[PDB]
Amino acid sequence: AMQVITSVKEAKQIVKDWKSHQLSIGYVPTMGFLHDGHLSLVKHAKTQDKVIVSIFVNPMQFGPNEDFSSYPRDLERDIKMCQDNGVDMVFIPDATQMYLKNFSTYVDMNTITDKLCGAKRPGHFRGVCTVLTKFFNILNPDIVYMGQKDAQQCVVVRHMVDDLNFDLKIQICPIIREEDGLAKSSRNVYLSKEERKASLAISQSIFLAEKLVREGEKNTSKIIQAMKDILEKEKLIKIDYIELVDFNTMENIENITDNVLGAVAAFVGKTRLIDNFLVQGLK
Amino acid sequence: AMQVITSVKEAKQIVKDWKSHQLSIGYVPTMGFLHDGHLSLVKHAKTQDKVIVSIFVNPMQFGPNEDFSSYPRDLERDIKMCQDNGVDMVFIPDATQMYLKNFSTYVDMNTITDKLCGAKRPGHFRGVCTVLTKFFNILNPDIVYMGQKDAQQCVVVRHMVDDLNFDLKIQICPIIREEDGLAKSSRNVYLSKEERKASLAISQSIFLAEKLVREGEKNTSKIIQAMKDILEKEKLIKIDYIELVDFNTMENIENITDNVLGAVAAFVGKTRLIDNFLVQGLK
Ligand SMILES: Nc1ncnc2c1ncn2[C@@H]1O[C@H](COP(=O)(O)O)[C@@H](O)[C@H]1O
Ligand SMILES: Nc1ncnc2c1ncn2[C@@H]1O[C@H](COP(=O)(O)O)[C@@H](O)[C@H]1O
Ligand SMILES: CC(C)(CO)[C@@H](O)C(=O)NCCC(=O)O
Ligand SMILES: CC(C)(CO)[C@@H](O)C(=O)NCCC(=O)O
């Protein structure tokens, strides 16, 4: 049996009871409208005794120029998918449970978040860090499962966890893709037929770049140009950024040594999509 | 037997073991050089199965114009006092355990901290919130015991705890005073003979103000003037602020209704002392 919980007080009691039986807790934070990407995280979380999925379209991490109002929402779909995939609790708080009238506290940081999407989305990572601090305090998980698809987010959260001494682990999981390469995302629902066809250039640029890197290419300027050439063939695509950075610091790399995070963000029509590849432990 | 612990890893293990035996934990955060004020907090904490005292002169909450370098330090004194008063663990981390090389995260808020001492001490409450978030995550206490002497701090921390869903309680304890009324403080060690004599005007102004309030005086402008008159008789005293505020919001009060926090900060020579009184539940 799976519990669908909307109350903070109630979620805390359930977690407290699990702890009293020394049960481990795996946690998958999401914004709902679930897909196979989220399910791959749940599957990893099943290594723990109990699995929690949160579904919360967090208003703090959206700006007015973004898509808070149109963000896909379908709780019936999500609940069914969690039920069918062995989730123990679905935590679906509404914003009035999470952010009371006098709420004014926040968590933020002075490194990492100023690069990539963080530079393009003022206030976004403050929203992410703040809401996850709350969820982590409420749910007291042992391992938190997050997708490599939001690479910078993984690094930001890992850093917050280290800096603030959260007694938990962040486990990063691989990007799950559609049959034709497109990284799975709830935002893919926005794409028209023509836009979806164009969006494939994003994953194609990622596939090429990773192939070049693994074949010994160290010049990031050259890799980026090769990626740009693919993307520029699609008139529906407006590049937001293409960057090859150090995976630990998010700082730009001119010449690759031990690691590289190659990240792309682009608008396909109005929809902002992201994708990346990550290579570590190069000689 | 009492454990003196300097390692974060070691403190976490001790706390984890206590939790496995379902023991409650009382926590008293301090900056060391202990006195009877701190001991009164320990006494309250003894309602819990285990008591932890932390001693850490937190560099984040001092500005360069303040007294980080001269802050009284005597670990031998502190350890003995904890030992003699039934403390189970004294946690004395050094700054390199707390703030690693790449540390950049912080906790702060957009209300409450901009008033009183917060307005006079830029960055102070960010330092307080950030370090207590870390201690709370490390030590996992059930109740945290703090002194009314730092009234604004109590309100700030309580708010952070509510906003970020920390599963613990903040218990506020009464101001402990020297025989002649001076609020106990490690900073009292700075005072010369003449300065200590002058400093008594601070507690005297507090005693008078509370008496006036409890006798039905509602005009804060009048109470503040009566306090000013006492303080202005001491040439060694330079007033930083005298404010009567709502205890929940820290906003100034012109006319008293249900509550009042009357707070004073003043320099006696170079030393910055604070004191207050708190009245609640007035008809
Ligand atoms: N295609 C994907 N593959 C792997 N993880 C993903 C994918 N899409 C989203 N996630 C992860 O799922 C979690 C919730 O995503 P979101 O629902 O978009 O807030 C985050 O950890 C994401 O990185
Ligand atoms: N005279 C006092 N009476 C009661 N509590 C105090 C007193 N002085 C300090 N405290 C509290 O002891 C804790 C540590 O104070 P400090 O050591 O100055 O950082 C804080 O909760 C203070 O409010
Ligand atoms: C981890 C959560 C679910 C926390 O709200 C969220 O930060 C997230 O995964 N969103 C990533 C995609 C985005 O917000 O643009
Ligand atoms: C609660 C602690 C010990 C946390 O460092 C500290 O914020 C504190 O009590 N100091 C109050 C006096 C001051 O820092 O000026």
CATH for A59? 3.40.50.620
Residues A114 and A238 in one domain: no
Among the candidates A132, A156, A177, a domain finishes at A177
Residues of A in contact with B163 (CB under 8 A): 100, 103-105, 134
CB atoms within 10 A of CB A21: 8
B226 three-class SS: helix
Sheet holding A169-173, edge to edge: A3-5, A89-91, A50-55, A25-30, A143-147, A169-173
Resolution, expressed in angstroms to one decimal: 1.9
Taking a C-beta distance cutoff of 8 angstroms, is the pair A23, A16 a contact? no
In this complex, the residue of B20, B111, B165 whose CB is nearest that of residue A134 is B165
What is the CB < 6 Å shell around ligand 4? B 29-31, 58, 61, 128, 131-132, 150, 153
Taking a C-beta distance cutoff of 8 angstroms, is the pair B125, B156 a contact? yes
User: Closest approach of chain A CAs to the CA of B216, in angstroms?
Assistant: 30
Whose Cα sits closest to atom 23 in ligand 2? B147
Among the candidates A159, A177, A195, a domain finishes at A177
Residues A210 and A86 in one domain: no
Cα–Cα distance, B43 to A253 (Å, whole number): 56
Long-range contacts, B136-140 (Cβ 8 Å, 24+): B136/B166, B136/B168, B137/A164, B137/A165, B137/A166, B137/A167, B138/A165, B138/A167, B138/B8, B138/B11, B138/B12, B138/B15, B138/B91, B139/B11, B139/B15, B139/B25, B139/B27, B139/B52, B139/B54, B139/B91, B140/A167, B140/B15, B140/B19, B140/B25
User: Residue type at B175?
Assistant: I
B147 three-class SS: strand
Residues B161 and B185 in one domain: no
CA of A13: which chain B residue's CA is closest?
B167
Experimental method: X-ray
Residue B282 lies in a domain: no
Cα–Cα distance, B255 to B260 (Å, whole number): 10
- The answer to whether the CB atoms of A160 and B105 lie below 8 A apart is yes
Taking a C-beta distance cutoff of 8 angstroms, is the pair A92, A75 a contact? yes
Single out the residue of A119, A124, A109, A115 nearest to residue A31, CA to CA. A124
Task: Tell me the best of B149, B152, B153 to mutate to test the pocket of ligand 2, counting ligand atoms within 8 Å of each CB and taking the most.
Answer: B149
Cα–Cα distance, B34 to B32 (Å, whole number): 5
Q: Which residues sit opposite B238 in a β-bridge? A: B267
A38: annotated active-site residue? yes
Beta pairing, strands B50-55 & B3-5? unpaired
Cα–Cα distance, B192 to B205 (Å, whole number): 21
Q: Is B173 on the interface with A (CB under 8 A)?
A: no
Taking a C-beta distance cutoff of 8 angstroms, is the pair A241, A202 a contact? no
Ligand nearest to the CA of A62: 3
Cα–Cα distance, B140 to B48 (Å, whole number): 13
Cα–Cα distance, A59 to A130 (Å, whole number): 11
Show the tokens assigned to B59.
């560099």
Please give the distance, rounded to the nearest whole angstrom, from the Cα atom of residue A153 to the centre of ligand 3.
Answer: 8
Residues B29 and B161 in one domain: yes
Cα–Cα distance, B99 to A206 (Å, whole number): 37
Chain A, chain B: beta-carbon pairs less than 8 Å apart: 82
What is the number of structural domains in chain A?
Answer: 2
Range of the domain at A251: 178-277
- The answer to whether the CB atoms of B163 and A12 lie below 8 A apart is no
